[PDB]
Amino acid sequence: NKNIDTVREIITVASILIKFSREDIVENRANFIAFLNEIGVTHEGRKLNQNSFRKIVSELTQEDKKTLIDEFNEGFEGVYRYLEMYTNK
């Protein structure tokens, strides 16, 4: 079902990664997105490859994006800063 619920899921499951095991496994572009696919959080029937992974955060409603920025201070900014730093095309 929904895009923002899935984004909320991804940020929740990644915030965990970020503060538990830290910059070790987060680093490696493939390993990071592979951790999300491991548990099978899927959207529109598709498992999130580097296209679909960034596109659900990038093609996201400004207001619901800002809601995450607002409420999840360190958690959203955490995945945000690392995804724009690490994950290219």
Binding site: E9, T12, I16, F20, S21, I25, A30, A34, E38
Partner: protein, 68 residues
């Protein structure tokens, strides 16, 4: 919760997907052993996920000689 850093949402996805039950009584030392164990559980996940990543997208990894 605020001290070690974890949100109610995060504890819920843990006991949804990762299988680890935050639901019992938690004191300091139990929180301690559970953080250890929960963190280690992720590096056990790591292992299993790097078997689904069969294709060569490996930049660098930990052999013997280049240790920290």
């Amino acid at each position: 919760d605020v001290l070690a850093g974890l949100t109610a949402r995060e504890a819920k996805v843990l006991r949804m997907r990762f299988g680890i039950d935050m639901n019992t009584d938690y004191t300091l030392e139990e929180v301690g052993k559970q953080f250890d164990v929960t963190r280690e559980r992720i590096r056990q996940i790591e292992a299993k996920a790097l078997r689904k990543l069969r294709h060569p997208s490996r930049s660098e990894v930990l052999r013997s000689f280049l240790d920290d």
